[PDB]
Amino acid sequence: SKIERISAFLNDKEVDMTFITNPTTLNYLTGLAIDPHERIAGLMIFRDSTPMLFTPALEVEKAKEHTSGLDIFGYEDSQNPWEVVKNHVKSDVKSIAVEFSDIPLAKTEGLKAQFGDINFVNLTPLIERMRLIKSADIEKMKVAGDFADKCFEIGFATAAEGVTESDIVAKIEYEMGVPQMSFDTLVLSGARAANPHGAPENVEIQENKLLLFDLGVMSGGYASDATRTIAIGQPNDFDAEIHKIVKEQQAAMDFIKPGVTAHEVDAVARDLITKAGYGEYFNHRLGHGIGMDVHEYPSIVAGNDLVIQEMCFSNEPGIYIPGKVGVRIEDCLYVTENGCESFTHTDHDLLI
Amino acid sequence: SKIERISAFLNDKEVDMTFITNPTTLNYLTGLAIDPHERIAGLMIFRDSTPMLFTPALEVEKAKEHTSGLDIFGYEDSQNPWEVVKNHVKSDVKSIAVEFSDIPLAKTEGLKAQFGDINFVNLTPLIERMRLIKSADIEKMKVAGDFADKCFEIGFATAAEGVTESDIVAKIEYEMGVPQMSFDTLVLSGARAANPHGAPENVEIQENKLLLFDLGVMSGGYASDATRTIAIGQPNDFDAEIHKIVKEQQAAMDFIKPGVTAHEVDAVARDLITKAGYGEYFNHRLGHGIGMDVHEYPSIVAGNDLVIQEMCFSNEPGIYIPGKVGVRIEDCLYVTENGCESFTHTDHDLLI
Ligand SMILES: [Mn+2]
Ligand SMILES: [Mn+2]
Numbered sequence: 001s002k003i004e005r006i007s008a009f010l011n012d013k014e015v016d017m018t019f020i021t022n023p024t025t026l027n028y029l030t031g032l033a034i035d036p037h038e039r040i041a042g043l044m045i046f047r048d049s050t051p052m053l054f055t056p057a058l059e060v061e062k063a064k065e066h067t068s069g070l071d072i073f074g075y076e077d078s079q080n081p082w083e084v085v086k087n088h089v090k091s092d093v094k095s096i097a098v099e100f101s102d103i104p105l106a107k108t109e110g111l112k113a114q115f116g117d118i119n120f121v122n123l124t125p126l127i128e129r130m131r132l133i134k135s136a137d138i139e140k141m142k143v144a145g146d147f148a149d150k151c152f153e154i155g156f157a158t159a160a161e162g163v164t165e166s167d168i169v170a171k172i173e174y175e176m177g178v179p180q181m182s183f184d185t186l187v188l189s190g191a192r193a194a195n196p197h198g199a200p201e202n203v204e205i206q207e208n209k210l211l212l213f214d215l216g217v218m219s220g221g222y223a224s225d226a227t228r229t230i231a232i233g234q235p236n237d238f239d240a241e242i243h244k245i246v247k248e249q250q251a252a253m254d255f256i257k258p259g260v261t262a263h264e265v266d267a268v269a270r271d272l273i274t275k276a277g278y279g280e281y282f283n284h285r286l287g288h289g290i291g292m293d294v295h296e297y298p299s300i301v302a303g304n305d306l307v308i309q310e311m312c313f314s315n316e317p318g319i320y321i322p323g324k325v326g327v328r329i330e331d332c333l334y335v336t337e338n339g340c341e342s343f344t345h346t347d348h349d350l351l352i
Numbered sequence: 353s354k355i356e357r358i359s360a361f362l363n364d365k366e367v368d369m370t371f372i373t374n375p376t377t378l379n380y381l382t383g384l385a386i387d388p389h390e391r392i393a394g395l396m397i398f399r400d401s402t403p404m405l406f407t408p409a410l411e412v413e414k415a416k417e418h419t420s421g422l423d424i425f426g427y428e429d430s431q432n433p434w435e436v437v438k439n440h441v442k443s444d445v446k447s448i449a450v451e452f453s454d455i456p457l458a459k460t461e462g463l464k465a466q467f468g469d470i471n472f473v474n475l476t477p478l479i480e481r482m483r484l485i486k487s488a489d490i491e492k493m494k495v496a497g498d499f500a501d502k503c504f505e506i507g508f509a510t511a512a513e514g515v516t517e518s519d520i521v522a523k524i525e526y527e528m529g530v531p532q533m534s535f536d537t538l539v540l541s542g543a544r545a546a547n548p549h550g551a552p553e554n555v556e557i558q559e560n561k562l563l564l565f566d567l568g569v570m571s572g573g574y575a576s577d578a579t580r581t582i583a584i585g586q587p588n589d590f591d592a593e594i595h596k597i598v599k600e601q602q603a604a605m606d607f608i609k610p611g612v613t614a615h616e617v618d619a620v621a622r623d624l625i626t627k628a629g630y631g632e633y634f635n636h637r638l639g640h641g642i643g644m645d646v647h648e649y650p651s652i653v654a655g656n657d658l659v660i661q662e663m664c665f666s667n668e669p670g671i672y673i674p675g676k677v678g679v680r681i682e683d684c685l686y687v688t689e690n691g692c693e694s695f696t697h698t699d700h701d702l703l704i
Contacts, residue, residue, distance in 0.1 A: 038647060062549065077637075077653075100458040105450070105472065108457060120457065170529040176554060177522040197414065202528060285429075295390060301429075 002029050003068075005130060006045045006123075015095035015121050018045045019085075019111065022102040024292055025127055027221060032066040034059055040081040040107070043070075044089070054085060082110040097123040132289070132297050133310055137222070138334050141291070141312065144224035145332060145343025147178060147217045152228050152346045155187065155213055159232055159352060165189060165200035172215065182216035182223040182294040193229070193326020196284075207233040210243075210326040216294060223294050225314055226344040227330035231351040239325040245276040246327050247348050249315045253333070256340040262298065262306035269317045270302060278319045289313045290332045311335045315342075354381050355420075357482060358397045358475075367447035367473050370397045371437075371463065374454040376644055377479055379573060384418040386411055392433040392459070395422075396441070406437060434462040449475040484641070484649050485662055489574070490686050493643070493664065496576035497684060497695025499530060499569045504580050504698045507539065507565055511584055511704060517541060517552035524567065534568035534575040534646040545581070545678020548636075559585040562595075562678040568646060575646050577666055578696040579682035583703040591677040597628040598679050599700050601667045605685070608692040614650065614658035621669045622654060630671045641665045642684045663687045667694075 006018060006029075020026065020043035027033045034041055036056055044052045050071055055063055057076035064072055075084040093115055098108070101124040108120060134141075151172050158171045165187040172185060187200045190209030205211060214227035229243065252268045261267070266286045273282050287300025290312045298306055298313055311334070318328025331342035358370060358381075372378065372395035379385045386393055388408055396404045402423055407415055409428035416424055427436040445467055450460070453476040460472060486493075503524050510523045517539040524537060539552045542561030557563060566579035581595065604620045613619070618638045625634050639652025642664045650658055650665055663686070670680025683694035 058548065098457070100456065100461060102456055102458075104452065104454055104456050105460060105474075106452040106454075106476070109452060122457075124458070166528055170526050173529065174522050174526050176518055177525065196410065 002130065003045055003051060006126070007047055009123075009126055010045065010047045010097065013095075013097075013121060015097050015119075016047065016091075016093045017089070017095075018043065018097045018123060019103075019107075020045070020099060020123070021107065022099050022127075025099060025102070028127075028131065028292055030066055030068065030070065032063055033221065034063065040075070040110075042085075044085075049091065052088065054081070054088075082114040085111070086114045093118065095119045095121055097121040099124045099127065128297055131291055134291060134312065135310065138312075140219065140222040141224065141332070141334070141343055144182075144217050144219035144222055145226070146345070147219055148215060148224045148226045148344050149346045151185075151215050151217070152213060152226070152344075155215070156230065156350075156352050159205055159211060162204060164202045164204050165192075166202040168205075169200050178217060178219070180218040182218050182225060186212065186214040186227075188212045188214075188326055189232070190326055191323050193328070194320040194322050194324035196320070205232055208236060210235065210239055212326045212328060214328070214330065222292050223290060224343055225290060225294055225330065225332050226346075227316055227318070227328045228346060228348070228350075229318075229327045229329060235351065236325065239327070242278075242319055242325060242327050245273060245278070246317055246319060246329055248272055249317050249329050249331070250348065252315060253331070253342060254339045256333075256335070256338075258307075258309045258335055258337060260308060262300055262304060262308075263302055264300075264308070265315075266300050266302045273317065273319060278321070281319045281321050282317065283320075286317055287313050287315060308335055354482065355397055355403060358478070359399055361475075361478055362397065362399045362449065365447075365449075365473060367449050367471075368399065368443075368445045369441070369447075370395065370449045370475060371455075371459075372397070372451060372475070373459065374451050374479075377451060377454070380479075380483065380644055382418055382420065382422065384415055385573065386415065392427070392462075394437075396437075401443065404440065406433070406440075434466040437463070438466045445470065447471045447473055449473040451476045451479065480649055483643055486643060486664065487662065490664075492571065492574040493576065493684070493686070493695055496534075496569050496571035496574055497578070498697070499571055500567060500576045500578045500696050501698045503537075503567050503569070504565060504578070504696075507567070508582065508702075508704050511557055511563060514556060516554045516556050517544075518554040520557075521552050530569060530571070532570040534570050534577060538564065538566040538579075540564045540566075540678055541584070542678055543675050545680070546672040546674050546676035548672070557584055560588060562587065562591055564678045564680060566680070566682065574644050575642060576695055577642060577646055577682065577684050578698075579668055579670070579680045580698060580700070580702075581670075581679045581681060587703065588677065591679070594630075594671055594677060594679050597625060597630070598669055598671060598681055600624055601669050601681050601683070602700065604667060605683070605694060606691045608685075608687070608690075610659075610661045610687055610689060612660060614652055614656060614660075615654055616652075616660070617667075618652050618654045625669065625671060630673070633671045633673050634669065635672075638669055639665050639667060660687055 039056045042054045052071040055074045057074040060074040075081045100122045158168045168187045169185045188198045190206045193212040212229045216225040252265045289296040289298045314332040316330030331344045333342045391408045394406045404423040407426045409426040412426040427433045452474045510520045520539045521537045540550045542558045545564040564581045568577040604617045641648040641650045666684040668682030683696045685694045
């Protein structure tokens with residue numbers, strides 16, 4: 001149980017209780033997706049008592065739909081959330097563990113008002129080492145990644161008769177309009193794709209030039225991310241296979257496998273680009289981790305030596321010569337021991 | 353100058369410097385819209401030195417586009433943001449003012465690592481009293497509010513031939529798809545509009561029933577919000593003018609004017625509903641403040657007596673009998689001394 005891993009840490013670090021705030025961490029622990037926004041909500045795990053969950057007076061009857069179970073209770077706006085919390089917790093509280101990365105001072109200060117000079121302890125690192133592996137629900141990241149293939153389908157088509165980059169984004173987002181993109185959809189024509197602040201604008205697509213897509217979705221809880229780059233009408237030759245240098249992605253999809261550096265795959269790629277001699281230009285991290293957030297561990301930067309086992313991240317290599325001729329390609333992937341596999345199935349070799 | 357108001361506070365409270373983090377507060381101060389997301393950025397105002405602005409190594413050349421001016425500098429990922437900050441600030445720093453509401457512990461702790469046992473002071477209340485009045489750019493909230501009228505146009509039409517609530521939302525969002533909605537667009541048919549967790553789903557609209565809209569946009573920086581409720585085919589009579597009780601909104605649009613309670617307009621409304629006798633059901637705050645965020649001060653709750661002067665907020669009254677017959681209406685408005693006025697011009701009396 002994920003909650004049992006946390007009691008264990010509390011016991012092990014002699015901290016009494018948690019007050020958990022990152023709404024993405026909530027649902028990963030609780031299976032419930034709540035967004036209090038301006039209001040307060042926290043997951044309170046203990047060393048050896050029954051875990052509670054605080055909630056606005058309005059979100060509570062719902063939260064008993066997940067259920068697990070957790071002792072659920074709330075506060076109306078008339079009253080001080082921090083008050084309610086203490087008049088529900090019994091037993092004494094010296095330490096609280098919270099997510100440093102997320103919890104603001106308005107909140108720690110709200111607790112201190114009520115509890116006193118409590119030592120705060122950083123839970124964030126733990127949650128991180130817990131999300132780094134999943135294997136629970138890779139199945140969920142499968143369907144999102146598959147919806148991105150369907151996004152690539154709709155996008156390609158839509159580049160056809162005056163159509164601009166925006167039009168293309170807007171049409172993909174219509175789809176239902178399945179709830180939410182995991183990040184801002186990119187459609188970038190020719191030399192706009194080399195910009196390190198490139199964004200779709202209402203500008204016609206360039207015929208005989210390259211078209212980059214890079215997109216992704218939130219399918220209920222988890223997330224996908226991908227980049228295809230295609231040609232609109234017969235492509236340029238220099239451009240033609242700057243695509244090749246980059247499609248070779250495939251010098252790292254079943255080359256893969258657990259127990260190799262981090263300086264590992266950012267080696268089979270960043271070298272094979274200096275091969276054809278564009279080591280610079282390609283001047284950003286190859287690879288970020290993926291799961292419930294579009295960006296997570298592991299980082300796949302060149303420098304230090306994180307071993308790989310059983311992990312989600314992404315394969316985005318691309319060369320950018322400012323004023324170029326656009327190109328990058330990306331799948332996200334999970335590590336099994338095979339071999340391995342990618343979350344997106346669309347063609348790396350195409351033209352429309 | 354908004355920045356000059358802050359030095360003044362620093363001087364007045366004998367605090368050396370600010371480290372400002374809420375990216376909506378940045379742009380309100382700086383005219384620049386930056387989103388570092390996982391990364392660090394802060395606006396550093398001093399008592400009597402030249403204000404600086406910290407930025408990722410990647411956002412900086414851009415930030416010199418606004419300009420003002422501010423001393424702009426950054427950090428690559430190789431290096432510790434908190435390090436850079438201290439090796440740029442000279443002079444001694446005992447106190448830092450930050451926005452309690454926004455700044456997490458990972459950040460205060462990052463500062464303390466570098467600076468030492470610094471007293472943190474709460475800037476948030478000041479920024480709030482500063483945003484409560486604008487009059488600078490009401491003009492910007494004018495065009496967004498006008499785009500919401502154009503959203504209401506597109507929406508109405510689109511309720512026509514199998515169309516569901518989702519379809520209608522999706523079509524409005526297509527529009528360009530002018531950047532961003534200020535909040536999740538609501539389209540709710542008949543009895544779905546009474547739910548206090550009502551959300552558009554892929555369900556056909558009910559003929560001879562009510563259709564609520566409530567929507568809004570981000571037009572570059574500021575924001576709008578509105579609710580119209582219309583009829584799809586000849587409406588029910590009980591429903592017909594539960595609309596009347598609620599359209600009477602107009603028992604508070606030029607009744608208005610500065611120097612009356614807060615328990616003021618949540619009196620001309622919440623009574624005139626008990627008039628026809630649905631005081632309960634209508635069980636939420638009438639009125640929230642609006643500006644750069646969809647929700648801001650002033651709160652217009654029943655209880656305490658905030659005077660009005662020269663302020664943005666919204667007029668959303670509506671009765672909800674669970675399993676009802678849907679109805680609410682809302683404009684947002686600014687206080688001038690006339691009279692006053694609303695940001696949305698569409699018809700409060702209609703049927704499609
Ligand atoms: Mn991507
Ligand atoms: Mn509204």
